[PDB]
Symmetry: C2
Subunit: 203 residues, 2 copies
């Protein structure tokens, strides 16, 4: 079965940037529901196994009667698992190779941060802003709807911000760009490095 | 210019079903923002005018370069303006003709309630649950994404529930069902009758 991973720090470790009550519901309620629903969907078709990253890379392989529910809850599970690991109570620095890849893709770091901030601002409704590695090994900023994940288009995400309202409403209310800025404070760039390394090597 | 209509009651009027603070952010920030954005798009084409209900009934007729912004913000404005009129601090009752059409399409009021509750609850991500008049004059429950509106498909809304998280997170957190059950205590059935009469009387 899919399991709910633990937060690898205390619920309040990201304060004042993300508030402990949000971390608690976001993980114990929202995330747990994605895992519970993904298990129920998968229980229905044991023959397909449970490797979500493989199943959701090509959604039409998933039998029709559970497809949208797996996209939604199976995607909710993967997006959130990735998200907890990209957050750090301790400040970190963009790694040399990650930084170099950025200048190359965007021209400078501030250009990236601005392209990223804007994909996150203008994602209308519920969804996620992403930094991804191309099938060409290049970086792109994108944004997806709801729990849709870029791995469904063969893109490898190395950074991700959740812009569903539940992620920021208790701390920032309507002011999503305040929450976006706060995110840059608590990114775990070591996770980003590892994801990006894993992106290139498995290619 | 599109104007932000005033709430037709005090902000704390829907208490304890909807909290004051939410009414306040929801109208003063969320709806104001759609109104502002809708106007910025419209001003780029003064020739197409300001009749949002006509423009959004055929989206395709809207110049490509403001079409998405119009759908989202224009849609945002209609749905919300409709939403404030549908809420009532006084418990009202279902008008006889409305009750009868609900009995006909659904079996009983409570059947309708469960069905509208199902659409409101399973809408994944941001959106709206609706009771609409068919092209054939029949009632149907549906839901839509984000700020999409059933008038875009030649359906006439007579009941609407915002299921965006900003509509309910302050008072109910992740438990959208408690929000939905509460919405039924504050429905203005007189706004529903009136919309229902209007839908039948333009065909
Ligand atoms: Fe989330
Ligand atoms: Fe709303």
């Amino acid at each position: 079965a899919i399991l709910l991973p633990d937060l690898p720090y205390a619920y309040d470790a990201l304060e004042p940037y993300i508030d402990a009550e949000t971390m608690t519901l976001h993980h114990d309620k929202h995330h747990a529901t994605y895992v519970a629903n993904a298990n129920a969907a998968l229980e229905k078709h044991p023959e397909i196994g449970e490797n979500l990253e493989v199943l959701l890379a090509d959604v039409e392989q998933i039998p029709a009667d559970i497809r949208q529910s797996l996209i939604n809850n199976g995607g909710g599970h993967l997006n959130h698992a990735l998200f907890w690991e990209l957050l750090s109570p301790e400040k970190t620095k963009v790694t040399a190779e990650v930084a170099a890849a950025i200048n190359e893709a965007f021209g400078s770091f501030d250009d990236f941060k601005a392209a990223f901030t804007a994909a996150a601002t203008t994602r209308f409704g519920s969804g996620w802003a992403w930094l991804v590695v191309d099938k060409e090994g290049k970086l792109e900023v994108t944004s997806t709807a709801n729990q849709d994940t870029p791995i469904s288009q063969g893109l490898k995400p190395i950074l991700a911000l959740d812009v569903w309202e539940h992620a920021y409403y208790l701390n920032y209310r309507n002011v999503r760009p305040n929450y976006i800025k706060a995110f840059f404070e608590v990114i775990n760039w070591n996770t980003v490095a590892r994801l990006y390394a894993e992106a290139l090597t498995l290619e």
